[PDB]
């Protein structure tokens, strides 16, 4: 109707105003500023440990806060806790549902979370007098499959699903404290800030969004992609993030200046991107592709510095330890690898 | 070199490895089937006859089946369809008693064309190059009752036939089967079922036996 047309025109002219404001604040590009810096030499990393025991595809993996323990998730119905130093096994948890796409490790070290294709997020308690791992809480309030889950503390969790909505939960009660809405398509990845006051989330409508955990509404929105968004992660500083799509391209965004800074693409790459992570100093950007090998990029010069090629299938998960000492990689060949 | 506790830790690791290997050899004793459909295509009737995500277990002639129904997902399909990459077979359902009905969202498109589009999407997927498809055509009695009152030209305006039950059924089956584009690596099985039957389990049993024999031949290098 007439009201709909006038409101659409209003939205269009707000969009024009926002575009003009974004264009006004762009004085220079990152390429000129970083031209004079000394490039990072070619980096060689070698497989220190190899992990065996999975009999299916490996989808999730998350480090711990002590930089020695990690958890791995596969569709064999098993969640395995490893010891990277001695290549032992501490716990093997059977799962009720074998369709898992995410896993998370509590910062304290007492709980572990998992879920997928069941619209339920399960919490497992490790430290028990009885001597076994038991279920502690099941969160079932979503409509689509869960894509990612992360811990804020021992009594708070944040979840993203394919029902276009994200949620904040309370473990002791089991009810959604806040619900974040505003996207258009599936939500695939979310990243928490180190200061735990904000979090970013990427969606399948080629858009990334910032959300405030406490108040409960979107702050900023970012566009610029051409296909789905698969991975997202925060810079160590907390004023930037990097995102990866299905069109063989990565981009870096800032929070204070709502603009796109640098893009990572190469002509020889025509495959997708699955996982993205940084280093401890924020100088290296590790990416996993569909072409069976991972790449390392210089986060400020967009120059390839090395390739980790030791897998036979797609790389599905990638992580970096808190101490910044090792890199963990997983794949569909049922093998984990620590690189150093 | 190891301490008095490192030896016990390594023993625990060996026990966990043994349990994992023992449990992994029992999951290959199971035959996995994935079921697809279009909502009103007669899914529930076959689920109740042959006995987020629904999982069903049943046994027939010493063969154990694990059936996955994922019709209640309502999300983007190409973000979770690679999970079922190594399933034994796909059970597809088409309601051919819906050639006259029209979609609720749009009055221009009918349900049969939607089913054909979804079948074309599933059959020519990159994750199902060598996966068998068992096609069930549902509600034939209602179709034979409806075909006399109303012609079948609405669904297929390029059809010239006797306008009887057998010719219409054969035409529908042929039109569905020409959608395949491999015809050498993949095999398609078609069957006509109504509300009351007793032979569907035998059909799926024969299909899965053929698939098992083919896989065994391929494993040994004799195929």
């Amino acid at each position, epitope marked *: 109707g007439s009201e709909l047309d006038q409101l659409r025109q209003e939205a269009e002219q707000l969009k024009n105003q926002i575009r003009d404001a974004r264009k006004a604040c762009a004085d220079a590009t990152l390429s000129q500023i970083t031209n004079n810096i000394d490039p990072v030499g070619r980096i060689q990393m070698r497989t220190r440990r190899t992990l065996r025991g999975h009999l299916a595809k490996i989808y999730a993996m998350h480090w711990g806060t002590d930089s020695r323990l990690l958890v791995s998730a596969s569709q064999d119905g098993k969640l395995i806790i490893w010891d990277s130093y001695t290549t032992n096994k501490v716990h093997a948890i059977p799962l009720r549902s074998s369709w898992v796409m995410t896993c998370a490790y509590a910062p304290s070290g007492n709980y572990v979370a998992c879920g997928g294709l069941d619209n339920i997020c399960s919490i497992y308690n490790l430290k028990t007098r009885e001597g076994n791992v038991r279920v502690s809480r099941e969160l079932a309030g979503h409509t689509g499959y869960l894509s990612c889950c992360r811990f804020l503390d021992d009594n708070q969790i944040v979840t993203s699903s394919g029902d276009t909505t994200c949620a904040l939960w309370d473990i002791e009660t089991g009810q959604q404290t806040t619900t974040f809405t505003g996207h258009t398509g599936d939500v695939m990845s979310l990243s928490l800030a180190p200061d735990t006051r904000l979090f970013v989330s990427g969606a399948c409508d080629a858009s990334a969004k910032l959300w405030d955990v406490r108040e409960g509404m979107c702050r900023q929105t970012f566009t610029g992609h051409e296909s789905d968004i698969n991975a997202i992660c925060f810079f160590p500083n907390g004023n930037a993030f990097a995102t990866g799509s299905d069109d063989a391209t990565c981009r870096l965004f800032d929070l204070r200046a709502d603009q796109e800074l640098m893009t990572y693409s190469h002509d020889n790459i025509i495959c997708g991107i699955t996982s993205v992570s940084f280093s401890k100093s924020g100088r290296l950007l590790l990416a996993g592709y569909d072409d069976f090998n991972c790449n390392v990029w210089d986060a400020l010069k967009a120059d390839r510095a090395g390739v980790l090629a030791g897998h036979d299938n797609r790389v599905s998960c990638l992580g970096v330890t808190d101490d910044g000492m090792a890199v963990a990689t997983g794949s569909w060949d049922s093998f984990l690898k620590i690189w150093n | 070199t190891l*301490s008095a506790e490192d030896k016990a830790a390594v023993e625990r690791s060996k026990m966990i490895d043994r349990n994992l290997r023992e449990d992994g050899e029992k999951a290959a004793r199971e035959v996995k089937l994935l079921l697809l459909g279009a909502g009103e295509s007669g899914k529930s009737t076959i689920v109740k006859q042959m006995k987020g995500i629904v999982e069903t277990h049943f046994t027939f002639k010493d063969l154990h089946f694990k059936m996955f129904d994922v019709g209640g997902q309502r999300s983007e399909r190409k973000k979770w369809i690679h999970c079922f990459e190594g399933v034994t077979a796909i059970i597809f359902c088409v309601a051919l008693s819906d050639y006259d009905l029209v979609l609720a969202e749009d009055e221009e498109m009918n349900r049969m064309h939607e089913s054909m589009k979804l079948f074309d999407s599933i059959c020519n997927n990159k994750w199902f190059t060598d996966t068998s498809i068992i096609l069930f055509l549902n509600k034939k009695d209602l179709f034979e009752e409806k075909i006399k009152k109303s012609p079948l030209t609405i669904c297929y305006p390029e059809y010239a036939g006797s306008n009887t039950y057998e010719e219409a059924a054969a035409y529908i089956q042929c039109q569905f089967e020409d959608l395949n584009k491999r015809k050498d690596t993949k095999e398609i099985y078609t069957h006509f079922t109504c509300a009351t039957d007793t032979k569907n389990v035998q059909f799926v049993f024969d299909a899965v036996t053929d698939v098992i024999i083919k896989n065994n031949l391929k494993d040994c290098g004799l195929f």
Partner: single-chain antibody, 231 residues
Framework: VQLVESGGGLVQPGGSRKLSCSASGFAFSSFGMHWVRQAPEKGLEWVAYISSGSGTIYYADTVKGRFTISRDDPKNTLFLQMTSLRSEDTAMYYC??????????????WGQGTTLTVSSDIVMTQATSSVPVTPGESVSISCRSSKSLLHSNGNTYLYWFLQRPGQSPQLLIYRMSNLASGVPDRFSGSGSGTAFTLTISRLEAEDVGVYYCMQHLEYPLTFGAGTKLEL
């Protein structure tokens, strides 16, 4: 969680019995099991050890070849078989559970004890034998070894446990730096190399008893003489 054992009666200088303990409240199949012997009005020493899966079995030199150990997982019961009892094997026996992985706390539950009456190795030395104390003040106890307990992996295997009059021992500190579960934050431990110390900041009426220090580098497990703390 509890462990109840029985089977301790009077014996002649020539004879045989067998002791049995039943667990209830935890997963028996994932716990290794021990036996500890304490002479009347004396200290306590180790007897044997059985691991999970019945793969590793260790005995003591003093009683090697004369006793038998056996475990039944489906019925959740541990046995001990006596063949020919001498006159020095008159004491009270205790049963202990332990689990070994990264971050575990072995020797966590001690259960109760049963009485049996008849008719190289690293030595733990605690010079002190009795200390009077007034509630509300700090206490410090020292335990000395004959070899450095620090292993190259970074772990130092020392264990501190308490014994009240008419009760069973309870774990306080394992690996001489970590505090157990279910105990107040008053106790603390420290030490380096050959000498180690345990400190209590504030003393109350429940801290009276005898304390022990135990080592775990290599078998057999050797305990030290108790350090009584009277009111």
């Amino acid at each position: 969680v509890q462990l109840v054992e029985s089977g301790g009666g009077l014996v002649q200088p020539g004879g045989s019995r067998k002791l049995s303990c039943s667990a209830s409240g935890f997963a028996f199949s994932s716990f290794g099991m021990h036996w500890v012997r304490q002479a009347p009005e004396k200290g306590l020493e180790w007897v044997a050890y059985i691991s999970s899966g019945s793969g590793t079995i260790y005995y003591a030199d003093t009683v090697k070849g004369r006793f038998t150990i056996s475990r039944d997982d489906p019925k959740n019961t541990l046995f001990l078989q006596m063949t020919s009892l001498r006159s020095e094997d008159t004491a009270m026996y205790y049963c202990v559970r332990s689990i070994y992985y990264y971050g575990s706390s072995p020797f966590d539950f001690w259960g109760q004890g049963t009485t049996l009456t008849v008719s190289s190795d690293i030595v733990m030395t605690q010079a002190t034998s009795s200390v009077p104390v007034t509630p509300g003040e700090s206490v410090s106890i020292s335990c000395r070894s004959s070899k450095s307990l620090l292993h190259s992996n970074g772990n130092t295997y020392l264990y501190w446990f308490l014994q009240r009059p008419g009760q069973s021992p309870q774990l306080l500190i394992y690996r001489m730096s970590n505090l157990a579960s279910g105990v107040p934050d008053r106790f603390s431990g420290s030490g380096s190399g050959t000498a180690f110390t345990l400190t209590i900041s504030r003393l109350e009426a429940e801290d009276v008893g005898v304390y022990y220090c135990m080592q775990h580098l290599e078998y057999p497990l050797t305990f030290g003489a108790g350090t009584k703390l009277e009111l």
